[PDB]
């Protein structure tokens, strides 16, 4: 079963780049849901430390132009 990660996507700012990012990062290694929320500038992402280096997840978005970050990450 996958792990839990909420992410911070600050920097984008409109509620224009939310799909977008989902669907696109619906195709990265070792994703296995993801809902972002503009309005709380923050998104979460289900995903293994297996497929994903934990953090690369994020660093693909800040790779998109939008500086994000981490807040939580995988465990149990």
């Given at each position: 079963g996958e792990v839990v990660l909420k992410m911070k996507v600050e920097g984008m700012t409109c509620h224009s780049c939310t799909?977008?990012?989902?669907?696109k990062i619906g195709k990265l290694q070792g994703v296995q849901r993801i809902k972002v929320s503009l309005?709380?500038?923050?998104?979460?992402?289900?995903?293994?430390p297996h497929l994903i280096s934990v953090e690369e997840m994020k660093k693909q978005i800040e790779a998109m132009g939008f500086p994000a970050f981490v807040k939580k990450?995988?465990?149990r």
């Open positions: 799909s977008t990012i989902e669907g309005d709380n500038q923050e998104a979460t992402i289900v995903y293994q990450i995988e465990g």
